[PDB]
Amino acid sequence: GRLTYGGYLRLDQLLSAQQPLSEPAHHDEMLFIIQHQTSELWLKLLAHELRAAIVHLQRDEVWQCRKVLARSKQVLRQLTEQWSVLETLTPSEYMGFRDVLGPSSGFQSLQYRYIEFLLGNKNPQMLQVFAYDPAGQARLREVLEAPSLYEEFLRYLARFGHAIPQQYQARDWTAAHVADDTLRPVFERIYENTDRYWREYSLCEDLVDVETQFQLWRFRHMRTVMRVIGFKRGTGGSSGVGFLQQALALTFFPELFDVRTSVGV
Amino acid sequence: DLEGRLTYGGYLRLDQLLSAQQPLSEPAHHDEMLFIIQHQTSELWLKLLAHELRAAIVHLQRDEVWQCRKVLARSKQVLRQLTEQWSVLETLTPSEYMGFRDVLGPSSGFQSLQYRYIEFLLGNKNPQMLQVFAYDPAGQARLREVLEAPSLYEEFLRYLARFGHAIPQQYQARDWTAAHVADDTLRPVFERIYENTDRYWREYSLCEDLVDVETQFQLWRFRHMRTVMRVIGFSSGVGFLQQALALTFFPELFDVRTSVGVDNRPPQG
Amino acid sequence: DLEGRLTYGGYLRLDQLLSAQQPLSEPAHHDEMLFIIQHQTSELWLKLLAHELRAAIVHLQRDEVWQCRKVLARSKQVLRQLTEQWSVLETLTPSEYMGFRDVLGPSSGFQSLQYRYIEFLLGNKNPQMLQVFAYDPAGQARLREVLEAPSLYEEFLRYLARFGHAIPQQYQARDWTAAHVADDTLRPVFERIYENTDRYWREYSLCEDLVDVETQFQLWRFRHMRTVMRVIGFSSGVGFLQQALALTFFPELFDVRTSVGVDNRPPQG
Amino acid sequence: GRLTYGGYLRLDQLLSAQQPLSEPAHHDEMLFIIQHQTSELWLKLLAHELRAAIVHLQRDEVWQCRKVLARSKQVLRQLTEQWSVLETLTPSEYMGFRDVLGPSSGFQSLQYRYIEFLLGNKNPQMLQVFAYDPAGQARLREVLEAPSLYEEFLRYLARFGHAIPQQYQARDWTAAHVADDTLRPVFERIYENTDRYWREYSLCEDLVDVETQFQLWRFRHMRTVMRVIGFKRGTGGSSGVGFLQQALALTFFPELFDVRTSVGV
Ligand code: HEM
Numbered sequence A, D: 001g002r003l004t005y006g007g008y009l010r011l012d013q014l015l016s017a018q019q020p021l022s023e024p025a026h027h028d029e030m031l032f033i034i035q036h037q038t039s040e041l042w043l044k045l046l047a048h049e050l051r052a053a054i055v056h057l058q059r060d061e062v063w064q065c066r067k068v069l070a071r072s073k074q075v076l077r078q079l080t081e082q083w084s085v086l087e088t089l090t091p092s093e094y095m096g097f098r099d100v101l102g103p104s105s106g107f108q109s110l111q112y113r114y115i116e117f118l119l120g121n122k123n124p125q126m127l128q129v130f131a132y133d134p135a136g137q138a139r140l141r142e143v144l145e146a147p148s149l150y151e152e153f154l155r156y157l158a159r160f161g162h163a164i165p166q167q168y169q170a171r172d173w174t175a176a177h178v179a180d181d182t183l184r185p186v187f188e189r190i191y192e193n194t195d196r197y198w199r200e201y202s203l204c205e206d207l208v209d210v211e212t213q214f215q216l217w218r219f220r221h222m223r224t225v226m227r228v229i230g231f232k233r234g235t236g237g238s239s240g241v242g243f244l245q246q247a248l249a250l251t252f253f254p255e256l257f258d259v260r261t262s263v264g265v
Numbered sequence B, C: 001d002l003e004g005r006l007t008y009g010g011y012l013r014l015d016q017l018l019s020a021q022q023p024l025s026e027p028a029h030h031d032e033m034l035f036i037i038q039h040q041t042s043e044l045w046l047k048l049l050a051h052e053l054r055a056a057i058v059h060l061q062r063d064e065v066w067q068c069r070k071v072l073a074r075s076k077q078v079l080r081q082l083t084e085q086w087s088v089l090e091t092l093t094p095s096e097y098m099g100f101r102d103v104l105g106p107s108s109g110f111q112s113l114q115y116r117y118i119e120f121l122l123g124n125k126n127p128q129m130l131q132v133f134a135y136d137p138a139g140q141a142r143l144r145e146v147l148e149a150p151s152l153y154e155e156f157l158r159y160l161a162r163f164g165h166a167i168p169q170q171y172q173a174r175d176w177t178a179a180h181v182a183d184d185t186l187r188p189v190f191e192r193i194y195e196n197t198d199r200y201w202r203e204y205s206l207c208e209d210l211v212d213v214e215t216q217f218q219l220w221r222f223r224h225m226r227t228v229m230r231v232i233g234f235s236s237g238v239g240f241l242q243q244a245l246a247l248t249f250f251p252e253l254f255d256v257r258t259s260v261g262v263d264n265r266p267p268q269g
């Protein structure tokens, strides 16, 4: 039933989801599949924890929010650390089964896109790649139309008297957040008196930690791709490494990094 | 299912994989998802580890040293992920766990077929373990195959025997179902290897790779135990996990450390 | 010394720091540099760890919870580096070590004053250890200061006592030179904290931080032992390191795991 | 003497090299100093191991070269991993003692420059920053005028019949290596028959590992700087993060990554 080790974990279903396509079977295809499936499981947990962080923020539950963010950091760290396994996959080995993948690519990862949206990097154009899946497409639209984790943090600050612009109370959440210079003084005050604003200070650093770890994931991702396919165009239709290098330019919480330039000045 | 074209989710069978997380708590407990995912990610890594370890055995059977080392290198990395991920579960507190532990069954990873496969492959054979898998005839059979076949260590010893090393004749044929017992007659064999790395660089490298594999495995065992300790606190239970730290897969490789010393270097050192 | 302007090397005193690596082997052995650097990098991290742990104590003495947690967070990261770096030394083989171990003295990190300071701060007090530092009156004195002062754990208990927790009166004044002994009367205190995290979130967070610190420290101890095992093989020696794994700094925090269970949650759970 | 724990390790000298300058003493200055000193010790070991790798390559000692490179990878990993400690240093804390540093900066790290030169990223213009130190400047010139680790690998391949250009037998080593398209076929052959060229294949992957880990160090370095000083100009006179982001564009073994694009095609 569900009380046995295997039944509780639904291993019959979990361990029958590895189906290589190369023929004859290529030894390194199992790594390729498992590498992605373990990542998808972590992404599922990450989304589970991040959704809870949003709820805690909405309810002004600071320590609870920090607790779930701490676990979120550990999950992102595992996702980043595991690239080391995939780096044992050489070009010689990969070219032995890359053709079986067809046009598929990471662009079609619904969970990854969900997390990107939740963190704030929204792009309604991505909903298109999931047209074949209206159900999943609907789930992406939901987070797309709701305030991001960052925006909820701003709304939290607003509830406590911080000089947060009125637009953050209600606006087109489907639009990706744009750097807001008027928020600079808000964060300067926090960092200039950490003893008083220790709650806000703690959350600011947690978000910086989360974004930094995410960028590290993006960087290791890019470097792994570079050592596997080099500068070949991707199966998804992009330039490959070039496109992944541009992703490193994206920022989730720009004001948190920009405030550094004026702190203590 | 994107216009007949293969998709990311289709290739990875995500509909099946992502529908395998079914918490039993009701109202659902926030921390049960971690409990499940922690186990499932580990089971996937263990499946890959078995896949790679079997390949390492095949390479040894073919005298393919660099290939064996490469597969073992990947194996070490997989074991490292299995070890590092305990940091996620360490964020589970007693306050959180007491909220859903009641709905769980009384079993642990001791019932993991894939894990047992790894233990068997590395050499920690235990015929009695086959009974706990009686419920599953199929899985029980595949486990019996590895049980009756030489372990990774024994294949390494057989490889050494094929190249002049003073490996005892008993390693050519015996009841492989019985766990390897420390053999002091292997000491001179490993001493010679470590005392002449210029000539035995292949054997030397494989010896260190096996020590790396066992060390990382022991680290996984320790982190496992320390995590269980901070969650439920402290044979059976934590005591059983403590005893597991005393088990060794390649005893002779560690024992030789105490007797190496012959200096066969040329002039100038 | 760049035109009177401070330089990178001058600020960091690199001329002094980078002239502290003096191998004794002659002809010099390639692997002796690793042996030295492995120890020196650890000694530097240990110096920082003491610096941070002392600050954590001060914060507890000032009821400064978020500050204490921040310092402990850095402390965990330093301990993590000390633990992770064993991977470098694991690349030292018996074949390499036997080439220079003869020129070394008979001492180990057991003679590390900075390490002993950490053990003392965390609470593993041992007045007898002061004698091994008899050669150094100064260092022996600074070590005596921490020995005679409440440990990080005892300051945490004193902090709890200042806020209504049922902490025994003996923790207000006693011979701090004596290592803390498991106190079962502390069980109800930690049970209440873990059973009402909404009210005792500060205490709850500090409890988990201390468990993190001890767990990471035990991991350092385990990696230390496993590395020594693969280098020299297996009280004293490896047996001593094995016994060190049985020591606990905050026993009551781990013991409470076995008795927590009161559900004080509101409706709906 | 030198037989005691402290005497052997010269701790009296090592543990008296931490001298903060802030007045009053700033708590976080010790971290700043130790963070760099531990890194410098690892860099010293890294140089020690890399020099040995070069010697092994010159003597065609493959497994020995791989052994030292393996340790080199572990050292680079520690150097990269330790950034996590420094990330606990917030802008608020740093601004409390950054002023005491004056014009000093990582540009003045002789050991780091030495390693950069040894790996092949040579720039005679850096010798200038070390004018105040002629002795150390002389040590940098030595590695500057000698073949890099990569060039020695090419010379190794040349000794075994690989189609290596004649210029690699003798040339102006002080000049940084420039991408050589004529090397593409050399590496393609290696990756196309790994069973035969397993020795060359192994070394190629070791170099890819080393460069990838080095780039990871550069990335974490840049991200840490971003969360500490943001986009402020550096004490060394550069744009700061902008300059460190450009460093990520540098490559040690370009042909090893470029070959990926044509492997199996
Ligand atoms: C053999 C190793 C891998 C290679 C060569 C590779 C390659 C690529 C390439 C070329 C792209 C760009 C789109 C395209 O043109 O295809 C991409 C995107 C992406 N990949 Fe990777 N990949 C690998 C492994 C992984 C793994 C293990 C994951 C984790 C599940 C992953 C997740 C993603 C994601 C989420 C995107 C979308 C990013 C975005 O839209 O910013 N990849 N990959």
Ligand code: HEM
Binding pocket: B038, B039, B042, B043, B089, B092, B107, B108, B109, B110, B111, B112, B115, B224, B227, B228, B231, B232, B236, B237, B238, B240, B241, B244
């Ligand atoms: C906080 C959660 C966990 C607790 C309390 C726990 C507890 C235990 C206990 C008490 C045992 C000893 C045998 C027994 O009495 O059943 C055990 C064994 C085992 N557990 Fe863990 N466990 C946890 C999580 C995990 C995870 C995530 C894995 C990864 C799949 C795992 C894998 C294993 C394995 C493979 C054994 C067998 C070891 C052996 O036979 O030496 N456990 N567990």
Ligand code: HEM
Binding pocket: C038, C039, C042, C043, C089, C092, C107, C108, C109, C110, C111, C112, C115, C224, C227, C228, C231, C232, C236, C237, C238, C240, C241, C244
């Ligand atoms: C391969 C090299 C090493 C070997 C063979 C080794 C061996 C030992 C042994 C046998 C002991 C037990 C006490 C004794 O008999 O002296 C010990 C204790 C100790 N060692 Fe290691 N060690 C090595 C490297 C290191 C390093 C790099 C450090 C970092 C500073 C270190 C730190 C310590 C400490 C702090 C103790 C005291 C522990 C305690 O009192 O619980 N050792 N070592």
Ligand code: HEM
Binding pocket: D032, D035, D036, D039, D040, D086, D089, D094, D104, D105, D106, D107, D109, D112, D221, D224, D225, D228, D229, D233, D234, D235, D236, D237, D238, D239, D240, D241, D243, D244, D247
């Ligand atoms: C508080 C943390 C740190 C900050 C804000 C920082 C900042 C900077 C900046 C702004 C530069 C560019 C040159 C300039 O304009 O100054 C630089 C360069 C450099 N830094 Fe860092 N740094 C930090 C920590 C470290 C550490 C721990 C190391 C390790 C020893 C390090 C090593 C280097 C090196 C080697 C360069 C020269 C790189 C090159 O020429 O490519 N820094 N740093």
Ligand SMILES: N[C@@H](Cc1c[nH]c2cc(F)ccc12)C(=O)O
Binding pocket: A036, A098, A101, A104, A105, A106, A229, A233, A234, A235, A236, B007, B008, B009, B011, B012
């Ligand atoms: N975009 C990759 C192909 C790819 C990478 N990861 C995955 C995962 C998956 F399920 C399918 C394809 C892929 C390439 O250009 O080679």
Ligand SMILES: N[C@@H](Cc1c[nH]c2cc(F)ccc12)C(=O)O
Binding pocket: C007, C008, C009, C011, C012, D036, D098, D101, D104, D105, D106, D229, D233, D234, D235, D236
């Ligand atoms: N370039 C840094 C200053 C800096 C960073 N690391 C060091 C090390 C050192 F010995 C002196 C200064 C520095 C800044 O712009 O803030």
Ligand SMILES: [Mn+2]
Binding pocket: B187, B188, B191
């Ligand atoms: Mn003998």
Ligand SMILES: [Mn+2]
Binding pocket: B260, B261, C098
């Ligand atoms: Mn000897």
Ligand SMILES: [Mn+2]
Binding pocket: C187, C188, C191
């Ligand atoms: Mn009670």
Ligand SMILES: [Mn+2]
Binding pocket: B098, C260, C261
């Ligand atoms: Mn209960």
